[PDB]
Amino acid sequence: MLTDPIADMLTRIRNATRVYKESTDVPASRFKEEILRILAREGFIKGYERVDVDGKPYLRVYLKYGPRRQGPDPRPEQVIHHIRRISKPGRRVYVGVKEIPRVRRGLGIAILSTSKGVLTDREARKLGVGGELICEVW
Amino acid sequence: GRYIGPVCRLCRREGVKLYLKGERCYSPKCAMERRPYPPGQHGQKRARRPSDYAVRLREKQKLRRIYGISERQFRNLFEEASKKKGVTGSVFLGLLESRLDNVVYRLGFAVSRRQARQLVRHGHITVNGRRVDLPSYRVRPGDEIAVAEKSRNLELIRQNLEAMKGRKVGPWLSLDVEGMKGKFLRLPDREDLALPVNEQLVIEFYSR
Amino acid sequence: DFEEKMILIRRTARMQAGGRRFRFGALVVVGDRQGRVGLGFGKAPEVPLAVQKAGYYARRNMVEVPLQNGTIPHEIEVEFGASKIVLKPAAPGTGVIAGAVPRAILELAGVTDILTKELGSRNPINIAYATMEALRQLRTKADVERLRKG
Amino acid sequence: VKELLEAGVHFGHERKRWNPKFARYIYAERNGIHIIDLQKTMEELERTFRFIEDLAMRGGTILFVGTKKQAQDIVRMEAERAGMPYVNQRWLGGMLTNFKTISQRVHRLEELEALFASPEIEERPKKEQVRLKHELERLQKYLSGFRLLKRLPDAIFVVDPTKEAIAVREARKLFIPVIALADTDSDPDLVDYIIPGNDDAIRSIQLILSRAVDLIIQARGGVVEPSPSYALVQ
RNA sequence: CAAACCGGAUUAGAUACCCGGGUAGUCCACGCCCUAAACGAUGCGCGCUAGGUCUCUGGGUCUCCUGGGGGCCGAAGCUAACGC
RNA sequence: GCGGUAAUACGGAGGGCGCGAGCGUUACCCGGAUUCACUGGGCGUAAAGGGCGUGUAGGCGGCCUGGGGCGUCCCAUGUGAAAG
Numbered sequence: 050m051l052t053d054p055i056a057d058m059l060t061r062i063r064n065a066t067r068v069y070k071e072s073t074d075v076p077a078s079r080f081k082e083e084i085l086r087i088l089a090r091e092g093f094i095k096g097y098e099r100v101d102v103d104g105k106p107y108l109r110v111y112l113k114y115g116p117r118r119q120g121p122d123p124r125p126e127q128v129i130h131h132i133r134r135i136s137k138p139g140r141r142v143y144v145g146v147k148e149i150p151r152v153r154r155g156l157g158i159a160i161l162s163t164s165k166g167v168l169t170d171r172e173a174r175k176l177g178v179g180g181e182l183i184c185e186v187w
Numbered sequence: 188g189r190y191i192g193p194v195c196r197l198c199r200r201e202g203v204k205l206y207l208k209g210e211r212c213y214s215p216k217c218a219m220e221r222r223p224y225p226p227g228q229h230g231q232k233r234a235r236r237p238s239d240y241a242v243r244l245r246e247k248q249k250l251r252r253i254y255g256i257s258e259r260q261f262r263n264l265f266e267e268a269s270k271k272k273g274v275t276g277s278v279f280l281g282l283l284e285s286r287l288d289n290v291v292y293r294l295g296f297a298v299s300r301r302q303a304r305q306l307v308r309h310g311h312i313t314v315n316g317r318r319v320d321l322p323s324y325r326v327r328p329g330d331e332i333a334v335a336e337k338s339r340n341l342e343l344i345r346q347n348l349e350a351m352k353g354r355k356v357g358p359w360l361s362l363d364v365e366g367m368k369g370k371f372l373r374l375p376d377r378e379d380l381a382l383p384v385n386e387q388l389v390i391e392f393y394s395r
Numbered sequence: 396d397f398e399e400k401m402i403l404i405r406r407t408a409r410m411q412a413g414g415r416r417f418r419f420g421a422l423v424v425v426g427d428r429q430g431r432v433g434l435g436f437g438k439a440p441e442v443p444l445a446v447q448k449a450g451y452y453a454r455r456n457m458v459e460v461p462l463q464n465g466t467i468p469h470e471i472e473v474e475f476g477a478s479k480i481v482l483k484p485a486a487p488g489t490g491v492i493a494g495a496v497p498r499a500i501l502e503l504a505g506v507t508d509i510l511t512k513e514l515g516s517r518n519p520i521n522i523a524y525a526t527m528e529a530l531r532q533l534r535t536k537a538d539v540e541r542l543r544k545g
Numbered sequence: 546v547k548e549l550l551e552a553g554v555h556f557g558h559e560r561k562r563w564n565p566k567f568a569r570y571i572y573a574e575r576n577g578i579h580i581i582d583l584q585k586t587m588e589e590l591e592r593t594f595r596f597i598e599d600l601a602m603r604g605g606t607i608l609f610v611g612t613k614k615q616a617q618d619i620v621r622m623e624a625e626r627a628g629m630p631y632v633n634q635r636w637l638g639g640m641l642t643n644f645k646t647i648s649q650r651v652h653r654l655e656e657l658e659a660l661f662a663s664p665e666i667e668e669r670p671k672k673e674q675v676r677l678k679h680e681l682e683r684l685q686k687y688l689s690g691f692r693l694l695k696r697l698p699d700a701i702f703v704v705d706p707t708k709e710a711i712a713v714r715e716a717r718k719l720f721i722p723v724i725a726l727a728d729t730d731s732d733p734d735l736v737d738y739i740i741p742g743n744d745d746a747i748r749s750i751q752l753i754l755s756r757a758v759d760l761i762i763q764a765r766g767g768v769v770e771p772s773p774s775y776a777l778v779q
Numbered sequence: 780c781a782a783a784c785c786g787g788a789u790u791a792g793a794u795a796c797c798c799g800g801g802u803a804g805u806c807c808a809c810g811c812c813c814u815a816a817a818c819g820a821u822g823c824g825c826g827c828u829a830g831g832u833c834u835c836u837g838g839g840u841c842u843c844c845u846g847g848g849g850g851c852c853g854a855a856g857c858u859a860a861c862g863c
Numbered sequence: 864g865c866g867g868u869a870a871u872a873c874g875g876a877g878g879g880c881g882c883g884a885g886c887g888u889u890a891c892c893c894g895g896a897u898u899c900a901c902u903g904g905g906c907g908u909a910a911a912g913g914g915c916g917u918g919u920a921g922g923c924g925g926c927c928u929g930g931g932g933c934g935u936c937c938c939a940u941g942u943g944a945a946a947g
């Protein structure tokens with residue numbers, strides 16, 4: 050079965066971008082969606098939208114890359130350089146507000162889930178909470 | 188002072204005029220001018236490329252052998268300067284330069300530091316009007332470094348200060364002659380000293 | 396102009412009938428100490444030739460390193476082969492705290508304060524190729540903003 | 546310098562030995578053959594010919610590379626028409642990345658022809674005379690219009706990316722813009738300016754290089770007529 | 780058919796390879812034994828990431844499309860390399 | 864790793880380097896050792912996939928809504944002696 054559906058998405062995305070797709074489909078959940086809301090806001094995607102494949106509900110993510118490059122290998126720079134699940138099943142990772150990590154000196158984000166809802170690193174620290182550290186993205 | 192040996196064979200090992208003697212070092216000697224190669228039967232054959240380590244080592248020696256100080260007492264200063272807040276390298280220089288044995292040399296009471304060391308150990312130097320016979324003593328800012336009241340008409344001191352009449356003393360030191368009195372205005376900053384040491388290197392050697 | 400350093404020279408050897416036949420390799424670095432570095436691997440019949448060749452090789456293959464007050468934007472870690480290099484920014488007064496290979500490269504790039512760790516295989520050649528890759532991979536807030544606008 | 550319904554019969558080509566990366570430029574699998582998106586061939590042509598204009602205007606050269614025999618002769622005329630150089634027979638290891646060293650062969654040709662207008666073709670032993678006259682043979686055979694190059698070209702026109710892929714690779718390593726006449730067997734992303742037509746079949750090929758060289762002359766300053774090739778393609 | 784074994788050869792020797800014999804065993808039933816280069820030297824499950832080609836077995840509008848299985852080549856990528 | 868008759872590696876000498884009222888040695892602990900890897904490792908061929916299954920406990924578990932608030936997070940407050 051699908052043991053972690055968040056990693057599934059996070060990965061689904063990582064996979065798609067490395068072959069430069071225009072978009073990719075993840076099967077849908079509000080929680081998954083509530084993450085894409087942030088990916089989108091912070092500039093990591095072009096955004097997403099609830100499409101509908103074979104009558105079951107998916108979230109089409111629209112990916113985003115650099116410009117074409119120079120010399121041999123013109124494949125463009127990735128926008129999502131790096132994106133990885135931190136907390137996982139059978140190793141949940143929770144942090145105090147005093148422990149929310151500075152990712153790449155802030156050049157990257159770290160989505161975490163708090164009782165004020167899903168939030169970036171900057172968001173929670175400048176709002177006073179902590180929670181389950183979901184994933185770093187940079 | 189300390190080390191107590193041939194000093195100019197050290198000038199000749201660092202390949203640098205070190206002035207561990209003051210006066211004669213301005214003559215046609217210091218060892219360097221006329222014979223500026225290393226001491227020893229070998230110090231005149233084509234010099235092999237110094238290992239990364241030697242380079243950083245020889246550089247520390249160049250700094251320590253200037254101020255004439257045990258490695259035990261050098262490192263103790265460096266570690267302190269390390270723990271301390273600020274560019275740990277220049278704080279080090281600030282610390283060596285804050286030594287009384289050296290401040291006496293800076294204010295030209297002695298013509299060398301070896302001479303300035305003894306001038307203190309034999310009690311001719313006073314701090315804030317009290318006497319201090321420790322080369323180690325850390326001069327703080329605001330302190331006045333006098334020549335001892337009852338040492339004033341002394342031969343070594345007379346010549347040494349009629350020579351100081353009309354000479355400039357560092358931008359971090361005051362000094363009035365006739366009164367045999369200096370003043371530690373401030374800890375010098377890195378560009379205030381003109382030390383032939385990379386110093387950045389000295390830091391690297393103490394983490395080998 | 397440029398400053399050359401040379402991290403290792405070595406004396407490889409191949410077999411032909413009746414005797415081994417030698418050769419020399421040179422890893423050299425060039426830098427202007429203001430954000431430009433090049434790594435050159437020059438192999439050749441005799442030593443000083445193999446150096447010359449590396450210096451030239453090192454000048455094509457330049458990296459534009461985005462210094463900031465003597466250090467780096469983020470912190471990268473990079474794997475080249477089984478070599479891993481770990482780069483970490485440090486405040487002024489720290490110095491290049493690094494193994495002797497990325498030190499060569501970093502100092503010549505003009506990084507004056509940094510933290511380093513060689514992890515995994517320590518082959519000086521692959522370690523050099525890795526810190527070059529680490530450097531090639533640095534981004535600044537400037538170029539990240541561009542990436543995620545539109 | 547146009548023609549849109551110059552599909553003629555030179556639109557789609559190649560079966561299913563495609564590079565799937567060429568998927569955007571295809572219309573359908575009309576009976577064992579991908580046919581090329583007609584519109585795109587014309588609008589890629591837009592941005593492409595545009596490129597080449599500014600190259601002739603600024604006064605730079607375009608190296609025409611076509612080795613494929615079903616396009617070989619065509620390259621010779623259209624590349625001779627424009628001033629530009631051509632690689633026609635076969636493409637040598639380092640025409641570009643080794644462009645100095647390769648040009649010793651040019652230094653010799655131009656200088657070996659100088660032997661053949663002197664009294665020293667009667668002088669010199671015939672041990673040299675036979676060798677040094679059938680050596681000039683081969684030189685003129687590969688470098689018949691590489692010799693026109695005195696430095697690396699500003700761009701490079703290949704008629705088959707896949708087939709002349711060593712030519713392409715060398716261009717990139719020296720950052721020289723690739724123009725290419727491509728179709729379904731190629732990697733489009735490896736090419737800067739693409740004319741998604743079809744690498745094989747003279748009816749295409751020449752049409753493209755005609756109109757391209759038309760444009761090169763037209764923009765350099767000469768505004769001319771029909772070509773030495775044209776319907777002399779059988 | 781063939782360990783052991785009994786002979787013939789070969790050999791410097793030949794407790795072997797070659798040759799003529801030959802018992803356990805190899806076969807059956809029942810009961811034990813539990814090992815191996817028990818090997819893809821690759822634990823099981825699920826999701827994702829170009830294609831081409833050969834083959835076994837379903838289905839459909841049957842130039843082909845769509846499943847399951849067995850091979851080969853290869854995108855991205857990985858690997859110390861070989862390779863995958 | 865040096866020494867087999869030209870030893871910068873042995874014994875002496877001159878010279879040199881490093882510390883210095885100390886300098887060496889042996890012993891032991893952490894370090895370098897991401898060399899038990901949580902941070903921070905691996906198992907096709909380097910050590911490492913259990914011969915294969917069935918399944919007990921245990922670990923883990925798709926989408927939507929509501930209650931609870933155990934985990935998780937936050938505020939306040941008590942305790943955290945002195946020495947270090």
Ligand SMILES: [Mg+2]
Nearest residue numbers: 474476477515
């Ligand atoms: Mg590895």
Ligand SMILES: [Mg+2]
Nearest residue numbers: 514515516517
């Ligand atoms: Mg190792």
Ligand SMILES: [Mg+2]
Nearest residue numbers: 707708730744
């Ligand atoms: Mg072809």
Ligand SMILES: [Mg+2]
Nearest residue numbers: 780781800801
């Ligand atoms: Mg028998």
Ligand SMILES: [Mg+2]
Nearest residue numbers: 781798799800
């Ligand atoms: Mg028998």
Ligand SMILES: [Mg+2]
Nearest residue numbers: 802803804805
């Ligand atoms: Mg029996």
Ligand SMILES: [Mg+2]
Nearest residue numbers: 808809810811
């Ligand atoms: Mg049985």
Ligand SMILES: [Mg+2]
Nearest residue numbers: 837838839841
């Ligand atoms: Mg059928």
Ligand SMILES: [Mg+2]
Nearest residue numbers: 847848849850
């Ligand atoms: Mg199959």
Ligand SMILES: [Mg+2]
Nearest residue numbers: 853854855856
């Ligand atoms: Mg590959």
Ligand SMILES: [Mg+2]
Nearest residue numbers: 858860861862
């Ligand atoms: Mg490989």
Ligand SMILES: [Mg+2]
Nearest residue numbers: 866868869870
């Ligand atoms: Mg001897």
Ligand SMILES: [Mg+2]
Nearest residue numbers: 866867869870
């Ligand atoms: Mg010997």
Ligand SMILES: [Mg+2]
Nearest residue numbers: 870871872873
């Ligand atoms: Mg000896």
Ligand SMILES: [Mg+2]
Nearest residue numbers: 865871872873
């Ligand atoms: Mg020894």
Ligand SMILES: [Mg+2]
Nearest residue numbers: 394395894895
């Ligand atoms: Mg340590």
